[PDB]
């Protein structure tokens, strides 16, 4: 056996995806390549303090390190070892550092069935920002991570498969396509749409969020994006009636918006409104391609994209990770910024229901940034001495001990 | 006919996609609805002044008004009269105000085959921006205006049409797809991509630009977007070899960057870049949906969206318009801002090869705004009393009389 499960631990469980967490949950973690070992072990240190300072031994994460990537290769000769997979299907929750793409990330998502990609982007107190007023950006994107025309159903223009489709459409649908065309089949799932809409509303109800906007270009693509918006509304009302209110209803004769507001906006002006009035958005729900575009812009609203964390949640499991590469160039030098992976840890806490410790990490970070206790990649523009990876983590801990 | 054609004017003979303009070109214009009359006449006033001040009496535009929209409904009982169509097919270039939708915008695009949507976006001076440093924003977006999912080949998840498609992909392509699936076929034309790339390059050459970047998601949609990139690169290197240089070429030795530079970038991260350092973009080339989204993100950079102008160009014709609605609320109150349509008139001047006239207008607008001589939409945010629609155009005219 490679691993030795913590006998004082207990698997996190799921009921209708409610995610029920024990006082001593076993959580997996993969160091990752490059800077991973450093930012991740630093993350695990700040989270434990955030847990003990908020619950004081009444709760404690029993970490279990599994191997994947170059560590697994340089030790067991398998970049993704069977024992590692068995621990993943059993414990179902991993905080994983960055891993090169020499696939492991896809493998994990597939085997745990993580369909929803979550990207929370809120401004942190004293960071540089391309915006003049970023101090209002507090949104979280919910992306259905295997649904748009990312499924892969496409063919080169000079392929016979493409010829088959062109012949088909021409006589079976009376649709005429030229020969010099590349063809892709965009597919929009009803089930997939409903599954992610549930997660979005659920999350809003658990963390008492107020607005849930649907990003869509359903005015032009009626049966894919348009269908998405329709279904989203359908299941939101057929299943969470007592919790939400359509924008069309408060803007009507049955107001009282003291609960979740489900509304929608065409995707065209979306890119405008996030750059000029980011406060207009809270929780954004959209298909796979939109979410890939909207989120990158989102994170641009507030510089230091590598200080954000994300997640991949499924009906029963989750994977959390910083949103940056392995930076093999700064590996083992105690220079890298561990904020990105610590922020994934925070998100992992929120999902866990442990909002008190999540909130501590957030406050600790905000404090340190405005107090100039930062790693070199930020202090460069904050003209002050840079703190190392371990030191930055310790400053957070040292701060956390004095709320 | 009801249109008395200028007998001292000549047709613009764009033969090679280059636009061969006489000294007295005949140009059609449509006032438009709501604020159409006011803002369009103002535009015509300032444009004739720029022409005259730059070329004296050696050149003069021979304006010819054609009816469309609600004006044509009152005068001719036809939203888009056949006579108006004869003039469009004959003179082929129009400056048109905004028009409601009970559309003629799409009809003109169709009958003149204007496949290219051009959107130049550049900062002004005293204009508020949501960006801290919007100064080095001088973009121009070249969008293929009828090429992908916008062609309309989609079907709802419960259509017999969709059933035929789901059957085909199964028995003939052997691809697995659920039944609760909306379907859209993304098409990408090798021909369409080449014609718009030519326009793009042809524009950089004639207007001393120096960078054409290809926006695409060729990393997940290789056979459509990826094909777009491949084909764009092909026609460039094959038909404009002596005018351009790929990114990969300069760094791989022999520089010669004294010619237009051509490169590409993935679209996901492109949306972050336009926000943190938009100066990195000159001419952006992209497919239909991408450019539809990249266009709003940019432009949302400078904020005053209604002060932007755009064009729809074909191999031999052109439509120029402000990028804003008809604002029925401000109709006939001399309050609407005419800058947008004027900017369209500016882009029109440029395409005609009359850069002197174009530069006058541009400098004039910058001087009026830095000197706070603006309409209500802008005065409201910069302390002084607004100028009316007429008065503002008059100020520009006196300004051009000085420079």
């Amino acid at each position: 056996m490679l691993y030795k499960e913590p006998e004082d631990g207990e698997k996190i469980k799921f009921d209708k995806g409610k995610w029920i967490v024990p006082n001593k949950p076993v959580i997996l973690y993969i160091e990752g390549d490059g800077i991973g070992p450093e930012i991740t072990n630093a993350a695990i240190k700040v989270i434990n303090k955030a847990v003990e300072r908020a619950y004081g031994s009444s709760r404690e994460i029993k970490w279990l390190e599994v191997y994947a990537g170059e560590k697994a290769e340089k030790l067991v000769n398998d970049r993704f070892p069977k024992e590692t997979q068995e621990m993943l299907l059993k414990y179902r929750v991993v905080l994983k550092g960055p891993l090169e793409t020499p696939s492991v990330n896809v493998a994990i998502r597939l085997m745990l069935d993580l369909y929803a990609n979550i990207r929370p982007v809120k401004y942190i107190e004293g960071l540089e920002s391309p915006l003049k007023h970023p101090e209002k950006v507090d949104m979280i994107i919910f992306r259905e991570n295997t649904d748009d025309l990312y499924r892969g159903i496409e063919y080169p223009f000079n392929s016979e498969e493409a010829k088959k489709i062109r012949d088909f459409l021409r006589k079976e649908l009376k649709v005429e396509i030229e020969d010099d065309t590349g063809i892709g089949i965009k597919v929009m799932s009803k089930y997939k749409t409903q599954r992610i809409t549930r997660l979005a509303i659920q999350y809003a109800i658990e963390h008492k969020r107020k607005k849930v906007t649907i990003m869509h270009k359903g005015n032009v693509m009626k049966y894919t994006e348009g269908a998405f918006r329709e279904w989203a509304y359908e299941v939101a009302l057929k299943e969470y009636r007592d919790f939400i209110v359509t924008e069309e209803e408060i803007n009507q004769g049955k107001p009282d918006q003291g609960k979740i507001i489900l509304n929608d906006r065409i995707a065209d002006n979306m890119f405008q409104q996030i750059i000029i009035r980011p406060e207009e958005y809270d929780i954004i729900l959209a298909p796979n391609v939109n979410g890939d575009y909207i989120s990158d812009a989102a994170g641009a609203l507030i510089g230091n994209i590598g200080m954000l964390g994300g997640a991949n949640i499924g009906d029963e499991g989750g994977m959390f990770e910083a949103i940056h590469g392995t930076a093999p160039k700064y590996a083992g030098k105690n220079v890298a910024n561990p904020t990105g992976i610590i922020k994934a840890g925070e998100l992992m806490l929120r999902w866990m229901g442990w909002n008190e410790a999540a909130d501590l990490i957030e406050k600790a970070i905000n404090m340190a940034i405005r107090d100039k206790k930062v790693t070199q990649d930020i202090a460069r523009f904050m003209g002050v001495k840079a703190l190392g990876t371990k030191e930055y983590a310790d400053e957070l801990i040292k701060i956390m001990d004095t709320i």
Side-chain angles (χ1 to χ4, degrees), chain A residues 55-307:
Chain A
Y55 312 125
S57 81
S58 74
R59 278 172 176 174
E60 174 184 291
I61 302 178
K62 302 252 80 177
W63 298 88
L64 186 259
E65 174 193 37
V66 304
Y67 312 130
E70 80 189 8
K71 187 172 180 181
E73 273 170 346
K74 292 161 192 175
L75 184 57
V76 188
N77 194 60
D78 187 318
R79 72 287 108 64
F80 189 56
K82 305 296 153 49
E83 281 202 59
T84 293
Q85 308 168 196
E86 292 317 311
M87 291 297 92
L88 285 164
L89 298 164
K90 179 179 180 163
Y91 289 107
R92 306 239 146 198
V93 290
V94 221
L95 174 68
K96 63 158 279 291
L99 290 169
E100 226 97 11
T101 315
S103 183
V104 166
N105 285 47
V106 179
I108 298 173
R109 260 171 273 166
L110 288 175
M111 72 182 302
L112 284 183
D113 192 23
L114 316 172
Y115 57 81
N117 182 294
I118 299 83
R119 303 279 272 84
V121 55
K122 165 147 74 167
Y123 183 54
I124 73 165
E125 258 64 337
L127 270 192
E128 289 261 289
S129 171
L131 270 50
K132 274 204 288 177
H133 301 300
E135 341 79 13
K136 201 75 174 181
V137 181
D138 181 359
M139 52 175 111
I140 162 181
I141 302 154
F142 267 76
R143 191 205 309 183
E144 157 48 56
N145 217 175
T146 170
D147 201 0
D148 217 307
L149 65 168
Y150 275 8
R151 287 197 181 183
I153 304 167
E154 67 179 331
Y155 304 107
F157 77 104
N158 62 322
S159 67
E160 48 193 19
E161 287 80 346
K163 185 120 289 174
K164 266 262 63 190
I165 311 177
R166 281 190 290 271
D167 283 351
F168 181 69
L169 309 177
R170 287 188 202 181
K171 197 175 69 179
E172 305 304 311
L173 286 305
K174 288 192 171 185
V175 178
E176 68 280 69
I177 293 187
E178 324 86 281
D179 295 319
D180 65 303
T181 63
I183 302 168
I185 283 72
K186 201 196 201 278
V187 182
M188 199 88 245
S189 174
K190 179 203 186 73
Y191 171 62
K192 282 181 177 55
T193 296
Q194 301 186 309
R195 87 201 304 197
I196 193 191
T197 300
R198 298 189 183 97
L199 239 308
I201 298 165
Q202 281 177 189
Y203 184 89
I205 301 174
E206 207 72 52
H207 306 267
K208 188 53 204 168
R209 279 264 147 173
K210 27 198 179 66
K211 194 188 288 173
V212 174
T213 303
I214 300 174
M215 161 179 205
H216 74 278
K217 193 73 188 179
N219 69 318
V220 184
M221 298 171 279
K222 292 144 292 190
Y223 312 123
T224 58
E225 301 242 316
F228 184 98
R229 196 244 301 108
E230 189 185 64
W231 293 316
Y233 266 119
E234 194 170 295
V235 70
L237 275 56
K238 182 189 287 68
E239 299 184 354
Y240 301 74
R241 183 63 277 193
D242 304 67
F243 300 77
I244 67 165
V245 287
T246 72
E247 175 177 286
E248 186 275 349
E249 283 178 353
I250 59 172
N251 190 55
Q252 199 187 177
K254 54 164 290 174
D256 56 286
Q257 66 286 164
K259 48 184 61 53
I260 303 84
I261 300 169
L262 172 63
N263 68 323
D264 62 282
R265 293 290 184 293
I266 39 176
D268 47 69
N269 70 65
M270 220 85 178
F271 278 112
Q272 275 180 45
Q273 281 301 85
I274 76 156
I275 296 174
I276 62 180
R277 197 168 180 171
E279 49 258 288
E280 207 51 49
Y281 302 115
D282 197 304
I283 289 179
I284 301 176
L285 194 66
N288 209 324
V289 178
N290 278 192
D292 189 83
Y293 288 130
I294 181 64
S295 57
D296 292 317
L301 297 181
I302 55 154
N304 312 279
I305 273 175
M307 277 183 85

Side-chain angles (χ1 to χ4, degrees), chain A residues 29-64:
Chain A
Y29 81 87
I30 299 150
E31 276 170 355
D33 315 315
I35 44 178
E38 310 180 279
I39 55 177
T40 288
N41 271 135
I44 286 172
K45 185 168 179 184
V46 303
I47 169 47
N48 284 333
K49 216 299 185 291
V51 171
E52 184 184 67
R53 209 281 189 285
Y55 312 125
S57 81
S58 74
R59 278 172 176 174
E60 174 184 291
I61 302 178
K62 302 252 80 177
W63 298 88
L64 186 259

